[PDB]
Amino acid sequence: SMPEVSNPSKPGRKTNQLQYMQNVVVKTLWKHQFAWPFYQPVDAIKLNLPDYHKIIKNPMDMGTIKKRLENNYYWSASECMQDFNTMFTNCYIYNKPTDDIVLMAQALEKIFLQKVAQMPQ
Ligand SMILES: Cc1cnc(Nc2ccc(C(=O)NC3CCN(C)CC3)c(F)c2)nc1Nc1ccc(Cl)c(NS(=O)(=O)C(C)(C)C)c1
Protein backbone atom coordinates (compact mmCIF):
# COMPACT_ATOMS: atom_id res chain seq x y z
CA SER A 1 0.00 0.00 0.00
CA MET A 2 0.87 3.71 -0.05
CA PRO A 3 2.04 4.42 2.65
CA GLU A 4 3.58 0.97 3.05
CA VAL A 5 2.79 -1.30 6.00
CA SER A 6 5.58 -3.83 5.29
CA ASN A 7 9.18 -3.59 4.09
CA PRO A 8 11.57 -6.58 4.20
CA SER A 9 14.68 -4.35 4.24
CA LYS A 10 13.54 -2.15 7.13
CA PRO A 11 14.34 -3.38 10.66
CA GLY A 12 11.23 -3.48 12.84
CA ARG A 13 10.35 -4.69 16.29
CA LYS A 14 7.95 -4.42 19.24
CA THR A 15 9.40 -2.75 22.32
CA ASN A 16 7.52 -1.83 25.48
CA GLN A 17 7.02 1.63 23.98
CA LEU A 18 5.60 0.25 20.74
CA GLN A 19 3.36 -2.08 22.74
CA TYR A 20 2.14 1.02 24.61
CA MET A 21 1.51 2.82 21.32
CA GLN A 22 -0.67 -0.07 20.17
CA ASN A 23 -2.47 -1.17 23.34
CA VAL A 24 -2.84 2.25 24.98
CA VAL A 25 -2.60 4.96 22.32
CA VAL A 26 -4.16 3.42 19.21
CA LYS A 27 -6.68 1.26 21.05
CA THR A 28 -7.92 4.17 23.20
CA LEU A 29 -8.29 6.44 20.18
CA TRP A 30 -10.01 3.67 18.23
CA LYS A 31 -12.80 3.56 20.84
CA HIS A 32 -13.37 7.32 20.72
CA GLN A 33 -16.69 8.46 19.26
CA PHE A 34 -14.89 10.94 16.94
CA ALA A 35 -12.27 8.48 15.62
CA TRP A 36 -14.25 6.83 12.81
CA PRO A 37 -13.36 9.36 10.02
CA PHE A 38 -9.72 8.35 10.58
CA TYR A 39 -10.03 4.54 10.50
CA GLN A 40 -9.35 4.37 6.74
CA PRO A 41 -7.55 6.50 4.15
CA VAL A 42 -9.44 9.61 3.10
CA ASP A 43 -11.71 8.73 0.18
CA ALA A 44 -11.55 11.91 -1.89
CA ILE A 45 -14.24 10.63 -4.27
CA LYS A 46 -16.83 9.75 -1.63
CA LEU A 47 -16.18 13.01 0.21
CA ASN A 48 -16.13 15.30 -2.89
CA LEU A 49 -12.58 16.56 -2.25
CA PRO A 50 -11.09 16.58 -5.78
CA ASP A 51 -7.93 18.44 -4.77
CA TYR A 52 -7.28 16.36 -1.64
CA HIS A 53 -4.30 14.43 -3.04
CA LYS A 54 -2.93 17.50 -4.81
CA ILE A 55 -2.58 19.27 -1.45
CA ILE A 56 -1.88 16.26 0.81
CA LYS A 57 1.25 14.47 -0.35
CA ASN A 58 1.89 12.26 2.72
CA PRO A 59 -1.50 10.65 3.46
CA MET A 60 -1.93 8.86 6.77
CA ASP A 61 -4.75 7.18 8.69
CA MET A 62 -5.19 5.11 11.83
CA GLY A 63 -5.81 1.89 9.89
CA THR A 64 -2.35 2.19 8.38
CA ILE A 65 -0.88 2.87 11.83
CA LYS A 66 -2.62 -0.20 13.25
CA LYS A 67 -1.21 -2.39 10.47
CA ARG A 68 2.30 -0.99 10.94
CA LEU A 69 2.11 -1.96 14.62
CA GLU A 70 0.68 -5.40 13.80
CA ASN A 71 3.52 -5.96 11.31
CA ASN A 72 6.32 -4.76 13.63
CA TYR A 73 7.05 -2.23 10.90
CA TYR A 74 8.40 0.44 13.25
CA TRP A 75 11.71 0.37 15.07
CA SER A 76 10.93 3.34 17.34
CA ALA A 77 7.77 4.69 18.91
CA SER A 78 8.91 8.03 17.48
CA GLU A 79 7.88 6.75 14.04
CA CYS A 80 4.38 5.95 15.27
CA MET A 81 4.16 9.45 16.76
CA GLN A 82 5.25 10.83 13.37
CA ASP A 83 2.39 9.00 11.66
CA PHE A 84 -0.16 10.40 14.12
CA ASN A 85 1.22 13.89 13.66
CA THR A 86 1.07 13.52 9.88
CA MET A 87 -2.57 12.46 10.16
CA PHE A 88 -3.48 15.44 12.36
CA THR A 89 -1.43 17.97 10.39
CA ASN A 90 -3.00 16.74 7.14
CA CYS A 91 -6.41 17.43 8.64
CA TYR A 92 -5.46 20.94 9.75
CA ILE A 93 -3.80 21.79 6.42
CA TYR A 94 -6.59 20.65 4.14
CA ASN A 95 -9.67 21.78 6.05
CA LYS A 96 -11.10 25.01 7.34
CA PRO A 97 -10.71 25.70 11.08
CA THR A 98 -14.52 25.60 11.44
CA ASP A 99 -15.03 22.22 9.75
CA ASP A 100 -16.30 19.57 12.15
CA ILE A 101 -13.53 17.20 11.04
CA VAL A 102 -10.95 19.62 12.47
CA LEU A 103 -12.62 19.66 15.90
CA MET A 104 -12.78 15.86 15.81
CA ALA A 105 -9.05 15.67 15.02
CA GLN A 106 -8.28 18.14 17.82
CA ALA A 107 -10.14 15.96 20.33
CA LEU A 108 -8.19 12.86 19.28
CA GLU A 109 -4.91 14.77 19.27
CA LYS A 110 -5.43 15.89 22.87
CA ILE A 111 -5.81 12.25 23.94
CA PHE A 112 -2.82 11.24 21.79
CA LEU A 113 -0.69 13.92 23.44
CA GLN A 114 -1.82 12.97 26.96
CA LYS A 115 -1.07 9.28 26.45
CA VAL A 116 2.30 9.97 24.80
CA ALA A 117 3.25 12.22 27.73
CA GLN A 118 2.64 9.25 30.05
CA MET A 119 4.49 6.66 28.00
CA PRO A 120 7.10 4.81 30.09
CA GLN A 121 10.85 4.85 29.49
C1 LIG B 1 -9.89 12.37 7.59
C2 LIG B 1 -10.61 13.53 6.90
C3 LIG B 1 -9.92 14.71 6.62
N1 LIG B 1 -10.59 15.69 6.04
C4 LIG B 1 -11.86 15.55 5.72
N2 LIG B 1 -12.45 16.71 5.10
C5 LIG B 1 -13.88 16.90 4.90
C6 LIG B 1 -14.74 15.87 4.53
C7 LIG B 1 -16.08 16.15 4.35
C8 LIG B 1 -16.55 17.44 4.53
C9 LIG B 1 -18.04 17.72 4.32
O1 LIG B 1 -18.75 16.87 3.89
N3 LIG B 1 -18.57 19.03 4.66
C10 LIG B 1 -19.99 19.30 4.46
C11 LIG B 1 -20.15 19.89 3.16
C12 LIG B 1 -21.59 20.37 2.93
N4 LIG B 1 -22.09 21.17 4.01
C13 LIG B 1 -23.28 21.37 3.84
C14 LIG B 1 -21.89 20.58 5.30
C15 LIG B 1 -20.44 20.16 5.51
C16 LIG B 1 -15.68 18.46 4.89
F1 LIG B 1 -16.08 19.75 5.08
C17 LIG B 1 -14.34 18.18 5.07
N5 LIG B 1 -12.56 14.46 5.96
C18 LIG B 1 -11.95 13.45 6.55
N6 LIG B 1 -12.60 12.20 6.85
C19 LIG B 1 -14.03 11.97 6.76
C20 LIG B 1 -14.42 10.65 6.69
C21 LIG B 1 -15.76 10.33 6.61
C22 LIG B 1 -16.68 11.36 6.60
CL1 LIG B 1 -18.40 10.97 6.50
C23 LIG B 1 -16.30 12.68 6.68
N7 LIG B 1 -17.33 13.69 6.65
S1 LIG B 1 -17.35 15.01 7.73
O2 LIG B 1 -16.06 15.63 7.90
O3 LIG B 1 -18.26 16.03 7.20
C24 LIG B 1 -18.00 14.46 9.34
C25 LIG B 1 -17.04 13.42 9.94
C26 LIG B 1 -18.08 15.66 10.28
C27 LIG B 1 -19.40 13.88 9.13
C28 LIG B 1 -14.95 13.01 6.76
Side-chain angles (χ1 to χ4, degrees), residues 3 11 13 29-30 35-36 40 48 58 62 70 77 98 101-102 107:
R13 65 182 173 170
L29 291 175
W30 205 277
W36 61 271
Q40 291 193 277
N48 193 28
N58 289 354
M62 283 209 306
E70 290 169 319
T98 57
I101 190 73
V102 165

mmCIF file of all heavy atoms in Angstrom, residues 3 11 13 29-30 35-36 40 48 58 62 70 77 98 101-102 107:
data_model
loop_
_atom_site.group_PDB
_atom_site.id
_atom_site.type_symbol
_atom_site.label_atom_id
_atom_site.label_comp_id
_atom_site.label_asym_id
_atom_site.label_seq_id
_atom_site.Cartn_x
_atom_site.Cartn_y
_atom_site.Cartn_z
ATOM 1 N N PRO A 3 0.715 4.832 2.157
ATOM 2 C CA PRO A 3 2.039 4.420 2.648
ATOM 3 C C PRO A 3 2.143 2.922 2.917
ATOM 4 O O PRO A 3 1.132 2.266 3.148
ATOM 5 C CB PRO A 3 2.173 5.188 3.967
ATOM 6 C CG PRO A 3 0.796 5.463 4.379
ATOM 7 C CD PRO A 3 0.032 5.706 3.128
ATOM 8 N N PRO A 11 14.454 -2.744 9.346
ATOM 9 C CA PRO A 11 14.335 -3.381 10.664
ATOM 10 C C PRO A 11 13.101 -2.882 11.407
ATOM 11 O O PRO A 11 12.762 -1.695 11.377
ATOM 12 C CB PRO A 11 15.633 -2.982 11.382
ATOM 13 C CG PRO A 11 16.282 -1.958 10.539
ATOM 14 C CD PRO A 11 15.734 -2.046 9.157
ATOM 15 N N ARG A 13 10.397 -3.945 15.036
ATOM 16 C CA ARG A 13 10.346 -4.692 16.286
ATOM 17 C C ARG A 13 9.131 -4.243 17.082
ATOM 18 O O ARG A 13 8.344 -3.404 16.636
ATOM 19 C CB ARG A 13 11.632 -4.486 17.091
ATOM 20 C CG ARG A 13 11.812 -3.055 17.539
ATOM 21 C CD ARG A 13 13.105 -2.850 18.294
ATOM 22 N NE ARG A 13 13.314 -1.428 18.553
ATOM 23 C CZ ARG A 13 14.249 -0.947 19.359
ATOM 24 N NH1 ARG A 13 15.062 -1.779 19.993
ATOM 25 N NH2 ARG A 13 14.355 0.366 19.541
ATOM 26 N N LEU A 29 -7.739 5.568 21.209
ATOM 27 C CA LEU A 29 -8.291 6.442 20.181
ATOM 28 C C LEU A 29 -9.315 5.703 19.337
ATOM 29 O O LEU A 29 -10.324 6.283 18.933
ATOM 30 C CB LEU A 29 -7.180 7.004 19.297
ATOM 31 C CG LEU A 29 -6.260 7.994 20.016
ATOM 32 C CD1 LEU A 29 -5.110 8.411 19.115
ATOM 33 C CD2 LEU A 29 -7.045 9.204 20.475
ATOM 34 N N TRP A 30 -9.085 4.414 19.074
ATOM 35 C CA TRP A 30 -10.010 3.666 18.227
ATOM 36 C C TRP A 30 -11.410 3.619 18.827
ATOM 37 O O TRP A 30 -12.401 3.623 18.088
ATOM 38 C CB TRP A 30 -9.476 2.251 17.990
ATOM 39 C CG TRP A 30 -9.971 1.625 16.733
ATOM 40 C CD1 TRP A 30 -11.159 0.982 16.546
ATOM 41 C CD2 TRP A 30 -9.287 1.581 15.483
ATOM 42 N NE1 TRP A 30 -11.255 0.541 15.247
ATOM 43 C CE2 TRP A 30 -10.117 0.899 14.573
ATOM 44 C CE3 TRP A 30 -8.045 2.053 15.041
ATOM 45 C CZ2 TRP A 30 -9.747 0.679 13.249
ATOM 46 C CZ3 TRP A 30 -7.682 1.830 13.734
ATOM 47 C CH2 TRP A 30 -8.527 1.157 12.851
ATOM 48 N N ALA A 35 -13.409 9.068 16.329
ATOM 49 C CA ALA A 35 -12.275 8.482 15.624
ATOM 50 C C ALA A 35 -12.628 7.897 14.262
ATOM 51 O O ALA A 35 -11.736 7.775 13.414
ATOM 52 C CB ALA A 35 -11.609 7.405 16.480
ATOM 53 N N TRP A 36 -13.900 7.575 14.015
ATOM 54 C CA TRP A 36 -14.247 6.830 12.808
ATOM 55 C C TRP A 36 -13.843 7.479 11.480
ATOM 56 O O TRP A 36 -13.542 6.721 10.543
ATOM 57 C CB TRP A 36 -15.733 6.427 12.829
ATOM 58 C CG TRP A 36 -16.650 7.604 12.885
ATOM 59 C CD1 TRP A 36 -17.123 8.225 14.007
ATOM 60 C CD2 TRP A 36 -17.187 8.326 11.773
ATOM 61 N NE1 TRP A 36 -17.924 9.284 13.661
ATOM 62 C CE2 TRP A 36 -17.984 9.365 12.294
ATOM 63 C CE3 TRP A 36 -17.083 8.183 10.387
ATOM 64 C CZ2 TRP A 36 -18.673 10.256 11.478
ATOM 65 C CZ3 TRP A 36 -17.761 9.072 9.579
ATOM 66 C CH2 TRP A 36 -18.544 10.096 10.125
ATOM 67 N N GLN A 40 -9.735 4.784 8.083
ATOM 68 C CA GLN A 40 -9.355 4.373 6.742
ATOM 69 C C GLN A 40 -8.776 5.576 6.022
ATOM 70 O O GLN A 40 -9.012 6.718 6.426
ATOM 71 C CB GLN A 40 -10.587 3.892 5.961
ATOM 72 C CG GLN A 40 -11.184 2.591 6.466
ATOM 73 C CD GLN A 40 -12.188 2.004 5.492
ATOM 74 O OE1 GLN A 40 -13.358 2.390 5.479
ATOM 75 N NE2 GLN A 40 -11.732 1.069 4.665
ATOM 76 N N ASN A 48 -16.091 14.146 -1.984
ATOM 77 C CA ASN A 48 -16.129 15.303 -2.888
ATOM 78 C C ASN A 48 -14.995 16.292 -2.609
ATOM 79 O O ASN A 48 -15.205 17.503 -2.499
ATOM 80 C CB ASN A 48 -17.495 16.003 -2.874
ATOM 81 C CG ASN A 48 -17.655 16.992 -4.015
ATOM 82 O OD1 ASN A 48 -17.045 16.836 -5.072
ATOM 83 N ND2 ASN A 48 -18.482 18.013 -3.807
ATOM 84 N N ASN A 58 1.539 13.352 1.815
ATOM 85 C CA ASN A 58 1.885 12.259 2.724
ATOM 86 C C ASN A 58 0.609 11.829 3.442
ATOM 87 O O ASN A 58 0.398 12.190 4.605
ATOM 88 C CB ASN A 58 2.890 12.707 3.787
ATOM 89 C CG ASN A 58 4.292 12.949 3.247
ATOM 90 O OD1 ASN A 58 4.593 12.685 2.083
ATOM 91 N ND2 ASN A 58 5.172 13.431 4.125
ATOM 92 N N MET A 62 -5.412 6.005 10.702
ATOM 93 C CA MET A 62 -5.193 5.111 11.834
ATOM 94 C C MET A 62 -5.175 3.644 11.423
ATOM 95 O O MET A 62 -4.539 2.829 12.099
ATOM 96 C CB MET A 62 -6.222 5.355 12.938
ATOM 97 C CG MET A 62 -5.941 6.594 13.768
ATOM 98 S SD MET A 62 -6.551 6.476 15.458
ATOM 99 C CE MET A 62 -8.268 6.049 15.177
ATOM 100 N N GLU A 70 0.901 -3.956 13.889
ATOM 101 C CA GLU A 70 0.684 -5.400 13.801
ATOM 102 C C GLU A 70 1.808 -6.105 13.046
ATOM 103 O O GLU A 70 2.075 -7.292 13.287
ATOM 104 C CB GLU A 70 -0.656 -5.675 13.127
ATOM 105 C CG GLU A 70 -1.816 -5.293 14.000
ATOM 106 C CD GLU A 70 -3.143 -5.301 13.282
ATOM 107 O OE1 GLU A 70 -3.217 -4.842 12.117
ATOM 108 O OE2 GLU A 70 -4.121 -5.752 13.908
ATOM 109 N N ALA A 77 9.057 4.048 18.705
ATOM 110 C CA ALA A 77 7.766 4.688 18.912
ATOM 111 C C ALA A 77 7.724 6.088 18.318
ATOM 112 O O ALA A 77 6.633 6.594 18.029
ATOM 113 C CB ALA A 77 7.426 4.723 20.411
ATOM 114 N N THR A 98 -13.161 25.811 10.967
ATOM 115 C CA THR A 98 -14.523 25.601 11.440
ATOM 116 C C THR A 98 -15.104 24.245 11.057
ATOM 117 O O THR A 98 -16.161 23.882 11.581
ATOM 118 C CB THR A 98 -15.448 26.702 10.904
ATOM 119 O OG1 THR A 98 -15.394 26.720 9.471
ATOM 120 C CG2 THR A 98 -15.031 28.058 11.445
ATOM 121 N N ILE A 101 -14.627 18.167 11.047
ATOM 122 C CA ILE A 101 -13.530 17.200 11.039
ATOM 123 C C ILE A 101 -12.324 17.731 11.804
ATOM 124 O O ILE A 101 -11.598 16.962 12.448
ATOM 125 C CB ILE A 101 -13.186 16.774 9.590
ATOM 126 C CG1 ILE A 101 -12.217 15.589 9.581
ATOM 127 C CG2 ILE A 101 -12.578 17.929 8.796
ATOM 128 C CD1 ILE A 101 -12.863 14.290 9.982
ATOM 129 N N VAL A 102 -12.099 19.047 11.770
ATOM 130 C CA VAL A 102 -10.953 19.623 12.470
ATOM 131 C C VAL A 102 -11.138 19.525 13.980
ATOM 132 O O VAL A 102 -10.200 19.187 14.712
ATOM 133 C CB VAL A 102 -10.722 21.070 12.002
ATOM 134 C CG1 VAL A 102 -9.805 21.808 12.957
ATOM 135 C CG2 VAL A 102 -10.155 21.076 10.593
ATOM 136 N N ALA A 107 -9.795 16.780 19.171
ATOM 137 C CA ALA A 107 -10.144 15.962 20.327
ATOM 138 C C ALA A 107 -9.248 14.735 20.414
ATOM 139 O O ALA A 107 -8.741 14.400 21.492
ATOM 140 C CB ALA A 107 -11.615 15.551 20.260
#
